[PDB]
Amino acid sequence: MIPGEYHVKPGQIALNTGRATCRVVVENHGDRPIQVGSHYHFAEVNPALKFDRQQAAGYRLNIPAGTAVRFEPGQKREVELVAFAGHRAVFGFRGEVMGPL
């Protein structure tokens, strides 16, 4: 008997289903670590991360909400991206779009 215990049913949850996804190879060229959050507009991440920014336009990391992917200096890795939904209007970040797309 454990007070307030859960009885979670086994299995898995599929995330961001039915949405466009693409894989991109990313490499950290800076001398300091960079960590990116699940909903950050990937095309506007720290300039030191080298990748096809044009392909990442309107995408974010396809990872569980609230988690992040770290890139130590010199680190290269392939990440999976999922497209933004809603109005698909990007405001903020580095101020590269500030509108729909």
């Binding site: 008997m1 454990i2 007070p3 307030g4 215990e5 859960y6 009885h7 979670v8 049913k9 086994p10 299995g11 898995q12 949850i13 599929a14 995330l15 961001n16 289903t17 960590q35 990116v36 959050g37 699940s38 909903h39 950050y40 507009h41 974010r60 396809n62 990872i63 569980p64 909400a65 609230g66 992040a68 999976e80 999922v82 933004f84 939904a85 809603g86 109005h87 698909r88 209007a89 990007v90 405001f91 903020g92 970040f93």
Partner: protein, 551 residues
């Protein structure tokens, strides 16, 4: 991507199909629904979702909520569901999916720069309790009740005076006015009951016009057929509720004579089982009537080994303290024949134990009677909905304030209680009043975080001066509101008017509308429904007890 259900529950709280144990009881709830879009849950923190352009949008204050409770497991009379809760202008705005419509799908609760966040993942959120049997013996009762999860207190009294020690009555215009003024200082919504024991209508109309939302008929002031009829006549014309503590002595007549005097008019019977007061030994038969809204006071809930020894001394005594009716009361609650639970604060009741005891009854009944006929699935969801309604929506309906409080529904005052599953019903994580946290466990004030010991309940900003006035309600009768009583006494808190007290009937009590063909044997005191004996066994040990309290 994909995530396992266990890691998912650890990060966002349980989802559809997962079960959670309520504290250390045998009650298990199963999530019936989840309003999220997997992968789009909002979480607050460094590198998390609720950030500019991401989970937080560009809308002005008017187009977003002031507060969002993220990933809450809601337990209410209408369902046990997982959802985000939006609060705007101190009221419940929506129950749905929070976020930023600019980049997220299905957003119904917009988060913007003007939005504060309370992380509710892994927590259970419920409406605040409503105690309707308060004896205003001391103002300290409000903090004790608020800490337990009760946000509305209805009752009467003037302090530690003999009249108040015995009855929930605030006698006359002067004391009513003084108490309405004093109420602005307490962090709970308050409504007062006047002394309804008089055979002259005008003496009652005055009290109603002064501000009381109900009239209490108590045997100590004379619960005679003449007094009862008089109070009910005025209640019928002023749209206020009548609460009753009948003639235990059978001085003016038996229970059938009292019931006859009431004449099918709406009335709230306090401690319907009888140990707390009422026609000996059969006042319990009142729960069979359509116009009676029956409640229990808490010392008899649930029947345990020490109950009788304790009561006999706390308290002809043997005609009032009956093992037969005390054992049956637990079952009648399980069946929905009794619709509310209350305290009877510092007058045969414990102010901080209304919620705690209601759940101990549910636990004891599950243990003894198994699943309710209404249960579906392998959980105790229906039993949980039936019992939570006893201290939330039902008390709100009985007293005509359900339009303001009583449940988690859009437009109602945002009185919410956040609980950690392991302490559900015992010690709340956060108590919100009208949109602001009013009291919560707080650790070392000088510490580097709010969690270091000692952690104990301390008043927060919602319980302070003007912020408090804005986050609490003082309920008035329609007559008092019309007369400008608030302006005359210069009341600082928000004002709410009661309405619909005369039209409620047993059939309106949520999940507790049973009208059993009940009888009590005059000699043996045995309770029978349809001829079958109703009884239960006394508990030797109860959950929500020694594992949580220091004393």
């Amino acid at each position: 991507s994909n995530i396992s259900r266990q890691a998912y529950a650890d990060m966002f709280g349980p989802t559809v199909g997962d079960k959670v144990r309520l504290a250390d009881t045998e009650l298990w709830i199963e999530v019936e629904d989840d309003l999220t879009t997997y992968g789009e849950e909002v979480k607050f923190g460094g590198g998390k979702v609720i950030r500019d352009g991401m989970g937080q949008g560009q809308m002005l204050a008017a187009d977003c909520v002031d507060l969002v409770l993220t990933n809450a497991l809601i337990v209410d009379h209408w369902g046990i569901v997982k959802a985000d809760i939006g609060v705007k202008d101190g009221r419940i705005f929506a129950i749905g999916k929070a976020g930023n419509p600019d980049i997220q799908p299905n957003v119904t609760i917009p988060i913007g720069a003007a939005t504060e966040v309370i992380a509710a993942e892994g927590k259970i959120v419920t409406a605040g309790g409503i105690d309707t049997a308060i004896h205003w013996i001391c103002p300290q009762q409000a903090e004790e009740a608020l800490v337990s999860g009760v946000t509305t207190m209805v009752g009467g009294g003037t302090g530690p005076a003999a009249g108040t020690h015995a009855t929930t009555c605030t006698p006359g215009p002067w004391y009513i006015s003084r108490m309405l003024q004093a109420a602005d200082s307490l962090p709970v919504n308050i409504g007062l009951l006047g002394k309804g024991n008089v055979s002259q209508p005008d003496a009652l109309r005055e009290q109603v016009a002064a501000g009381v939302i109900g009239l209490k008929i108590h045997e100590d002031w004379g619960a005679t057929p003449a007094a009862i009829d008089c109070a009910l006549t005025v209640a019928d014309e002023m749209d206020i509720q009548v609460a009753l503590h009948s003639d235990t002595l059978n001085e003016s007549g038996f229970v059938e004579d009292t019931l006859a005097a009431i004449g099918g008019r709406t009335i709230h019977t306090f401690h319907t089982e009888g140990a707390g007061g009422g026609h000996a030994p059969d006042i319990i038969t009142a729960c069979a009537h359509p116009n009676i809204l029956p409640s229990s006071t808490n010392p008899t809930l649930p029947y345990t080994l020490n109950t009788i020894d304790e009561h006999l001394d706390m308290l002809f005594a043997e005609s009032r303290i009956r093992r037969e009716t005390i054992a049956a009361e637990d079952v009648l609650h399980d069946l929905g024949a009794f619709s509310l639970t209350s305290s009877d604060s510092q007058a045969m009741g414990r102010v901080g134990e209304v919620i705690l005891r209601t759940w101990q009854v549910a636990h004891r009944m599950k243990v003894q009677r198994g699943a309710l006929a209404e249960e579906t699935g392998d959980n105790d969801n229906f039993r949980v909905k039936r019992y939570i309604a006893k201290y939330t929506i039902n008390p709100a309906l009985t007293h005509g304030i359900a339009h303001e409080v009583g449940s988690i529904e859009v437009g109602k005052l945002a009185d919410l209680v956040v609980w950690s599953p392991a302490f559900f019903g015992v010690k709340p994580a956060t108590v919100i009043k009208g949109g602001m946290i009013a009291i919560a466990p707080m650790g070392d004030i000088n510490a580097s975080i709010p969690t270091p010991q000692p952690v104990h309940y301390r008043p927060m900003f919602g319980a302070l001066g003007s912020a408090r006035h804005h986050c609490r309600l003082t309920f008035l009768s329609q007559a008092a509101a019309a007369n400008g009583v608030a302006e005359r006494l210069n009341l600082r808190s928000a004002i709410a008017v009661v309405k619909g007290c005369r039209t409620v009937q047993k059939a309106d009590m949520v999940h507790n509308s049973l009208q059993p063909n009940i009888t009590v044997d005059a000699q043996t005191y045995e309770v029978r429904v349809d001829g079958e004996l109703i009884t239960s066994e006394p508990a030797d040990v109860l959950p929500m007890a020694q594992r949580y309290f220091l004393f």
